[PDB]
A paper describes a structure:
Chelicerata sDscams could be classified into two subfamilies, sDscamα and sDscamβ, containing one and two variable Ig domains, respectively. Crystal structures and cell aggregation assays demonstrated that both α and β subfamilies of sDscam used Ig1 for the isoform-specific trans recognition in a hand-in-hand manner. Furthermore, the cis interactions were established by the three FNIII domains of sDscam, which assemble into a cross fold with a kink between FNIII2 and FNIII3.
To elucidate the molecular details of trans interactions of sDscam, we determined the crystal structures of Ig1 from Mesobuthus martensii sDscam isoforms α1, α7, and β6v2. We also determined the crystal structures of sDscam Ig1 from another chelicerate species Limulus polyphemus (isoforms α7 and β3v7) to provide insights into the conservation of sDscam trans recognition within Chelicerata. The crystal structures of sDscam Ig1 from both M. martensii and L. polyphemus revealed a common assembly of antiparallel homodimer for both α and β subfamilies of sDscam. A previous study has demonstrated that Drosophila Dscam1 Ig7 use its ABED face to form a homophilic dimer through a charge complementary mechanism to ensure an antiparallel binding mode. Similarly, sDscam Ig1 also employs the ABED face to form an antiparallel homodimer. Electrostatic and shape complementarity had been observed in all Ig1 dimer interfaces.
Author numbering:
A (entry chain A): -4 to 95
B (entry chain B): -2 to 95
The structure:
Amino acid sequence: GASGSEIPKIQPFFFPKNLTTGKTVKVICNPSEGSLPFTFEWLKDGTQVVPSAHVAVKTHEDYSLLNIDSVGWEDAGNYSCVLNNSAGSDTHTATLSVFA
Amino acid sequence: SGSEIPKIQPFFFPKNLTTGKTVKVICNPSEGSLPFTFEWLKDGTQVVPSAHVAVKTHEDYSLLNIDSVGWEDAGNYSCVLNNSAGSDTHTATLSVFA
Ligand code: NA
Ligand code: NA
Ligand code: NA
Ligand code: NA
Ligand code: NA
Ligand code: NA
Ligand code: NA
Ligand code: NA
């Protein structure tokens, strides 16, 4: 029937604060509001995240999971999720710090 | 090897929850040996899934999803993370503006 077209709104996500070398960290990007369907994009410090042996992105219909194993200093930085549907887009950026 | 005790990555609920929002939180280890099992509690009692409350557990994380959150969903949610070597629990408060 009538299809509501609602701009998406990202649920704010943040990284843990005393993360030390070698640990695993996960964050989720998901809408709190918005019409289906959703697309997700992850950025790190100005470029799209590239999956690797220790970095993985797993995207579902209504959320996307960023996983980093064996964190090191190179994994520190600002990670952004860009969320879109057919009505609009939203973005959230979270800073990851990695300590010795 | 394979006997590293689990430790949950601290999780928290958003601070902007209004009635009707979808909310998701994940429980996952920052350390610990695979395989894991997960349990969710609400105010000390295991979560009962329903039409608008879903628990989806994967190999290395568990997802709590609440559609159309309301005042009745407010409470203290615990994730219990288990493996062969031990157990950890983390609890976070879900608050809803009304
Ligand atoms: Na956090
Ligand atoms: Na998280
Ligand atoms: Na992932
Ligand atoms: Na760094
Ligand atoms: Na940035
Ligand atoms: Na976009
Ligand atoms: Na109880
Ligand atoms: Na799910």
